[PDB]
Amino acid sequence: ITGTSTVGVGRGVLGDQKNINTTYSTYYYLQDNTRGNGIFTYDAKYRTTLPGSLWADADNQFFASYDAPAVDAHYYAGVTYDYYKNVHNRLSYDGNNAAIRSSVHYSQGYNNAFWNGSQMVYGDGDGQTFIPLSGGIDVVAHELTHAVTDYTAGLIYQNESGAINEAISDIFGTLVEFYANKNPDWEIGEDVYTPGISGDSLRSMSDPAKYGDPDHYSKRYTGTQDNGGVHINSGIINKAAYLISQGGTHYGVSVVGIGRDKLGKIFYRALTQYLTPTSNFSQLRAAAVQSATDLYGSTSQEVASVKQAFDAVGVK
């Protein structure tokens, strides 16, 4: 980890060639010194001990199939860092250039990725439901966004607060996907989910109900599974964010879209200034309204569209 900054080349999970920032000191390590206090990628070696070994490579070429998840985790963490810095003037997830650490090859056949409070963790998938999860830029940015949330609003991962937490991660993951312009859409995880099946995804922001997630508050899940429905009830907020950006008419309520850039600015302000650990959906509405008011004025179209979007999903 002390060494010379250089640039290697590899291939990602989807077979695309990319340049990655590495560090040389006997080996070439997946350590990018160009962004904050660094981006570090580790090999968990199919175990669950974390973080594992800082990724070392002998020749600075990462074309082995074992390398692919590491290349993508490392590269997409950099892209996400760039988004937050360039678009929102935020230096890493803590606002003070905290090192970003990711471990890949976590466990065996593990169909998930997560932020654990310290670092990102990516399974390889079982090869049927998922391929290695770091192949999805929206997934990577979703996870890194959990770190942002943790250092700002601190939304508890239960019930409505947790659904907001999830939605925020889906929103910014999507916004990062659009920023990188990597075949962007309003779907989540499409690039790594069900390699055997075309056109699906884990979740949809444009139409959450496509996969049985609610798209209206009256359809919210109130049981105890999934921490009280954090990945299920996120669909209500996701639909609202999609409406704010893209517009549409939903359950008879019409929303004029104000586009992705303004969506991002509103939600980022809401997240960093107004939300608290126990914020519920109703408070999110107030926060988003206040945020749009701050940025664009109380008689703006932007404020009107935020109100319409939350009315469309039944959030008062």
Which one, 206 or 293, has the nearer CB to Ca ion?
206
**Is 190 annotated as belonging to a binding site?**
yes
Which one, 10 or 36, has the nearer CB to Ca ion?
10
**Is 138 annotated as belonging to a binding site?**
yes
What's the token pair of residue 180? Answer: 């990188």
**Is 43 annotated as belonging to a binding site?**
no
CB distance 236 to 216 below 8 Å: yes
Which one, 1 or 197, has the nearer CB to Ca ion?
197
* Least distance from Ca ion to the Cβ atom of residue 136, Å: 7
Nearest to residue 250, comparing CAs of 305, 307, 311, 203? 311
Per CB under 5 A, residues contacting Ca ion are: 57, 59, 61, 138, 177, 183, 185, 187, 193-194, 197, 200
Per CB under 5 A, residues contacting Zn ion are: 166, 169
- 3-class SS at 245? helix
**Is 200 annotated as belonging to a binding site?**
yes
- 3-class SS at 138? helix
Cβ-proximal residue to Zn ion, closest one: 169
Dist CA 261 CA 162 (whole Å): 24
**Is 116 annotated as belonging to a binding site?**
no
Choose among Zn ion, Ca ion, none what residue 57 binds, the Cβ cut-off being 5 to 8 Å by kind: Ca ion
Choose among Zn ion, Ca ion, none what residue 169 binds, the Cβ cut-off being 5 to 8 Å by kind: Zn ion
Catalytic status, residue 143: yes
What's the token pair of residue 100? Answer: 């970003």
Dist CA 114 CA 8 (whole Å): 26
* Catalytic site residue from 105, 143, 160, 250: 143
Dist CA 69 CA 99 (whole Å): 19
* Least distance from Zn ion to the Cβ atom of residue 128, Å: 22
What is the rounded end-to-end Cα distance, in angstroms, of the chain? Answer: 51
Strand segments (E) across 26-160: 27-29, 31-32, 39-43, 53-54, 56-57, 61-62, 100-106, 113-115, 120-123
Question: To 5 degrees, how large is the angle CA 200–CA 68–CA 131?
Answer: 30
Choose among Zn ion, Ca ion, none what residue 294 binds, the Cβ cut-off being 5 to 8 Å by kind: none
* Least distance from Ca ion to the Cβ atom of residue 61, Å: 4
Which one, 29 or 93, has the nearer CB to Zn ion?
93
* Catalytic site residue from 105, 216, 231, 250: 231
Dist CA 133 CA 124 (whole Å): 6
- φ/ψ (deg, to 5) at 230: -65, -35
| Residues facing residue 120 across a β-bridge | 102, 115
Which one, 137 or 255, has the nearer CB to Zn ion?
137
CB distance 183 to 302 below 8 Å: no
* Least distance from Zn ion to the Cβ atom of residue 222, Å: 20
**Is 261 annotated as belonging to a binding site?**
no
Cite the annotated binding site for Ca(2+) by residue number.
57, 59, 61, 138, 177, 183, 185, 187, 190, 194, 197, 200
Cite the annotated binding site for Zn(2+) by residue number.
142, 146, 166
Cite the annotated binding site by residue number.
57, 59, 61, 138, 142, 146, 166, 177, 183, 185, 187, 190, 194, 197, 200
Positions annotated as catalytic residues are 143, 231
